[PDB]
Amino acid sequence: KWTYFGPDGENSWSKKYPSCGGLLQSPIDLHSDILQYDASLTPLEFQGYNLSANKQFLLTNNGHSVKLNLPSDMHIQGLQSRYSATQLHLHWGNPNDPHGSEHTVSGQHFAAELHIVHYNSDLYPDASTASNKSEGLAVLAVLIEMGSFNPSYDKIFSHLQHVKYKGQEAFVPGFNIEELLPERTAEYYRYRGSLTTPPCNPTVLWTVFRNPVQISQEQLLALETALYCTHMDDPSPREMINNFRQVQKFDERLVYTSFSQ
Amino acid sequence: KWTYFGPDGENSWSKKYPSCGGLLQSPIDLHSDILQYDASLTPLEFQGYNLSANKQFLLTNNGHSVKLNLPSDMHIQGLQSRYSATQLHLHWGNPNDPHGSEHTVSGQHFAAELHIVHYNSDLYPDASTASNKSEGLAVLAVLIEMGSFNPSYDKIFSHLQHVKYKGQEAFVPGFNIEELLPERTAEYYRYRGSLTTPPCNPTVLWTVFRNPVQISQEQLLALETALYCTHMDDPSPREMINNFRQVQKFDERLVYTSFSQ
Ligand SMILES: COC(=O)c1cc(S(N)(=O)=O)c(SCCc2ccccc2)cc1Cl
Ligand SMILES: COC(=O)c1cc(S(N)(=O)=O)c(SCCc2ccccc2)cc1Cl
Ligand SMILES: [Zn+2]
Numbered sequence: 001k002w003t004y005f006g007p008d009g010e011n012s013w014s015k016k017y018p019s020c021g022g023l024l025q026s027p028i029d030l031h032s033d034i035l036q037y038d039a040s041l042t043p044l045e046f047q048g049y050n051l052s053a054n055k056q057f058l059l060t061n062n063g064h065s066v067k068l069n070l071p072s073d074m075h076i077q078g079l080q081s082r083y084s085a086t087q088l089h090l091h092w093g094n095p096n097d098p099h100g101s102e103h104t105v106s107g108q109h110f111a112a113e114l115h116i117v118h119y120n121s122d123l124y125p126d127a128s129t130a131s132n133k134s135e136g137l138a139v140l141a142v143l144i145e146m147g148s149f150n151p152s153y154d155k156i157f158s159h160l161q162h163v164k165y166k167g168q169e170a171f172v173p174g175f176n177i178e179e180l181l182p183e184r185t186a187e188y189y190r191y192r193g194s195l196t197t198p199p200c201n202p203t204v205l206w207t208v209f210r211n212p213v214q215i216s217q218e219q220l221l222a223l224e225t226a227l228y229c230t231h232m233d234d235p236s237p238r239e240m241i242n243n244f245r246q247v248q249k250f251d252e253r254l255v256y257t258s259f260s261q
Numbered sequence: 262k263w264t265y266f267g268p269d270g271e272n273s274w275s276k277k278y279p280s281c282g283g284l285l286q287s288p289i290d291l292h293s294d295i296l297q298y299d300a301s302l303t304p305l306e307f308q309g310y311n312l313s314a315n316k317q318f319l320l321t322n323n324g325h326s327v328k329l330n331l332p333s334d335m336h337i338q339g340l341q342s343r344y345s346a347t348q349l350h351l352h353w354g355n356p357n358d359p360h361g362s363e364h365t366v367s368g369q370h371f372a373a374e375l376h377i378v379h380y381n382s383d384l385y386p387d388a389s390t391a392s393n394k395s396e397g398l399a400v401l402a403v404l405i406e407m408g409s410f411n412p413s414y415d416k417i418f419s420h421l422q423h424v425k426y427k428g429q430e431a432f433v434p435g436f437n438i439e440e441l442l443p444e445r446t447a448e449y450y451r452y453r454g455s456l457t458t459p460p461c462n463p464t465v466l467w468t469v470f471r472n473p474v475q476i477s478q479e480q481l482l483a484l485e486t487a488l489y490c491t492h493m494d495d496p497s498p499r500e501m502i503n504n505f506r507q508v509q510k511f512d513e514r515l516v517y518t519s520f521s522q
């Protein structure tokens with residue numbers, strides 16, 4: 001139902017999904033007036049990110065993004081509970097405007113954004129259960145800029161022509177997910193927010209890394225042209241483009257940084 | 262029945278005001294990739310802006326902004342139809358994040374923004390009737406930044422004390438409203454959009470002047486701190502801050518400019 005364009009687009013999500021009009025919404029613009037250094041923001045540790053190349057992981061077009069399912073043995077160490085991986089996915093723009101990150105920095109969009117979604121597996125037996133509970137989810141966000149070809153991201157992008165339509169699934173060999181993260185992961189922004197898609201649950205601890213990664217113009221164009229929101233047999237196809245939400249009012253929140261300058 | 266925060270804030274406007282989820286929504290980011298010079302964009306003429314110093318004009322806090330009523334002999338010449346003034350008002354942020362313009366320029370907010378609202382008096386009898394009709398409205402927008410003290414803006418701001426609470430009203434002696442416009446009004450951005458407040462009708466021809474005006478740090482703080490959304494005897498007062506809408510998606514569309522250089 002919900003979309004990023006037209007009558008069912010983001011200003012209407014709250015009609016069906018009340019949390020979309022509630023507090024603590026994401027994404028946000030990261031800018032100086034709302035940043036505050038917090039020396040207690042110690043480095044995360046990425047455990048079991050190096051997935052075996054002999055195993056395979058399900059890539060699915062869900063009608064809104066492309067998502068890779070991740071195993072629960074993959075987890076973040078360093079939060080106040082263990083958060084185990086559940087899936088990663090992307091947000092992007094379109095061929096004529098490759099500026100589709102969700103978070104912005106000092107008012108500017110990056111080309112795209114990767115989210116790696118984790119859930120509190122100490123407390124909950126699955127991400128769905130966790131998704132509507134306080135600090136149930138932790139998402140890592142990587143800002144993506146147009147730059148050099150990125151062989152690691154291509155381990156995902158080379159399979160897109162196989163998940164072109166809603167409901168389609170493909171298998172991706174395992175690779176080291178840490179290769180999708182930027183330099184100096186110890187430098188990040190941290191804030192309490194929400195899912196950026198319906199149902200917009202305000203249950204996410206966000207970590208946005210300070211530094212972007214690069215993928216090429218050709219890899220952005222492939223991501224921006226490969227996928228459809230609709231099923232393979234739909235007589236009204238809709239391209240999966242511009243699948244990012246506008247930034248949200250801050251509502252008195254600060255964003256805490258692990259870097260001072 | 263609508264606010265800029267909490268459950269009745271901007272993501273929920275479309276429930277009771279469907280146009281807020283429709284096409285042509287404002288405000289937008291004015292950025293370089295979407296600007297196009299249009300030599301057809303000739304200077305506007307501001308007629309009847311020099312309000313009789315012998316008349317008085319009603320200033321009201323309406324719960325959403327401070328509004329000054331304007332007379333129908335004040336008008337813009339230079340558009341296809343005459344557009345007669347109805348009211349002016351402002352939008353601003355808060356002292357902790359004093360960047361509350363509605364339009365942005367290359368992703369940047371200005372401190373505040375003045376709107377002078379006009380309606381098509383050639384086609385329609387009053388602004389209420391024009392507001393949901395084709396070619397109905399024209400708004401001039403001035404971007405405001407902190408700098409030197411501005412005596413002309415103080416012709417309004419010196420009355421804020423008298424309109425602290427919702428419902429309150431003051432009378433302002435006429436002065437020359439052209440004094441609120443920036444330098445080189447021939448230089449502007451032009452696009453078709455919407456009201457930025459409910460009912461968000463997509464009936465506004467926008468003119469956003471290229472150059473900002475300045476007000477002092479004290480004047481900006483006064484604007485940010487002087488007013489409440491709530492009635493005087495409301496036991497839970499709410500400050501009138503952050504009364505701007507987030508920027509809207511604007512895809513496959515241009516903003517025309519009267520300047521190239
Ligand atoms: C267009 O983007 C999406 O489709 C998407 C976005 C988010 S996001 N951008 O990280 O807030 C999540 S998080 C889903 C969390 C969750 C997992 C399991 C069960 C319920 C919820 C999931 C999806 Cl499928
Ligand atoms: C917080 O801002 C406001 O309160 C406000 C904003 C607009 S705006 N930002 O220019 O879209 C208009 S325009 C009112 C046009 C109109 C005239 C008569 C009857 C209905 C609407 C009016 C008001 Cl009262
Ligand atoms: Zn996401």
Ligand SMILES: [Zn+2]
Nearest residue numbers: 350352376457
């Ligand atoms: Zn306005």
